Amino acid sequence: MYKPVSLFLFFLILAAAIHTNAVQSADEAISKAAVLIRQPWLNEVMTGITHLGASSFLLPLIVIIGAGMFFYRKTWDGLLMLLVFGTDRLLNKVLKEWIERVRPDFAPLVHESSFSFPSGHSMNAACVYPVIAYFLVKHLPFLSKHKKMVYIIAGVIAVLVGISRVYLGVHFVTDVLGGFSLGLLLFFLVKGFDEKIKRFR
Template sequence: MAAQKTVSNSPKKLTKFSKSLIWGLSISVLLLAIFAKLSNDLLYHELETFDRVIGELIRGFDTPYLTSVAIIITHLGSAYIEIGLMFIVGALLWFRLNHTWETVLLAISFGGAWLLNTILKELFHRARPDIVHLVKAGGYSFPSGHAMVATAFYGVIGYLLWLHLRNRSKPSWYIIVLTFALIIMIGISRIYLGVHFASDVIAGYASGGVWAIACIIGLKEIRKYK
C-alpha cells in the first residue's frame, strides 16, 4: 500500500513541478526579450527620448520630503543592507529552521545577481545620466545594479516568506504585493535621484527577475529529490 501511494503521488508532484517550470521558463523568456530589446535600442542610441521623458516625469515630483524618502528607499537596495539581511535571514533559516538549501539559495540570489550585473555593466559601458546626482554613485549605468540585485534578492526572500506562510490562517498574497512594491520603489528611487536612466532600471528588473526565477526553480529541483 505504501508503495502504491508513493507511485500515485509521483505524477501529481511531477505535474505540479512541470507547471511551475513552464511558468518560470515562460516568464524568463519574456524578461529576456525585454532585456534584449533594451540592449539593442541602447546600442543603436534609440533610448534617449524614452529615458528623457520618463526621467523628467519622475523627477518632476521633486520635493525635499520626497528626496529624503527616495534616499531611504534607495539605501534598501544597497549592498550593505542586503548583505546584512542575508546574514540575518540566512541564520534564521539555517539555525532555527534547519533549511540549509534555502540559506544557500539566498546567498546565490545576491552573489550571483551582483556578479552578473558587474559583467553586464562592463559589457555595455553606459555612462550614468549627465545630471545632478542626489546620491553618490559610481561605475557604469546599464543595467541598474540596485534594480537587478533587489529584484533577485528581495524576490527570493519574498518567495521564501510566501513558501513558509502560505498554509497559515492569515493570507500570504500580501507578501508578494509588498515584495513587488519594494522592488519597484527601489528602481524608481534610482531614476528620481538622477543616478540611472529608466531603461537601466527596467533592464535591471528583467535580468534580476530571470536570476530570481532560476534560483527558485533550482530550489524546487533540489527539494524534489530530497
C-alpha cells in the same frame, strides 16, 4: 518556462534599444521630467527607500534571514540565497563593464561612479526580495495564508527601489527595466531549481 525566457529576450531587446536616438531621447525626457516633481522632503524619503536595494544593506539582510531560518527550521537554504545574490552582483558588474553606458548626470542626488546599464539597485531588489518571499513562505507556516500579500510586498519594495533610482537622477528608466528583468530572471531560476529538488510535494 516562458517567464525566464521572456525576461531574457526583453533584456536583449533593451540592450539593443538603448543605442537608438529615439530611446535615448525618451530616457532623457523622463529623467528630466522626474526632477519636476522633486521636493526636499521627498528627496529624503526617496534616499531612504533606495537603500533597500543597496548591496551593503541586502547582504547582511540575507545573512540574518538565513540564520533565522537555520535556527527555526535547521534549513541551509540561506546559502542558496547568498549564492543567487552573488551571481546577481557578478552578472551586473560584467554587463555594466561590457555595455559602458554613461550615467544621466543631469541632476543626481546620490553619487555613483560606475556605468549605468543595468541598474545595480534594481537588479538587486528584483532578485533578492522575491527570493526572500519564496523562502519565507516555504519555511514559515504562519505565512502560508498570506502568500499573495508576501509576494505583493516584495514586488512593491522592488518597484519603489527602481522608481527611486530614476527620481534620484542616477539611472535611466531603461537601466531600471533592464535590471528588473535580469533580477527577476534569477529569482525564477532559483525558485525553479529549489522546487525541482523537492522529494515531497
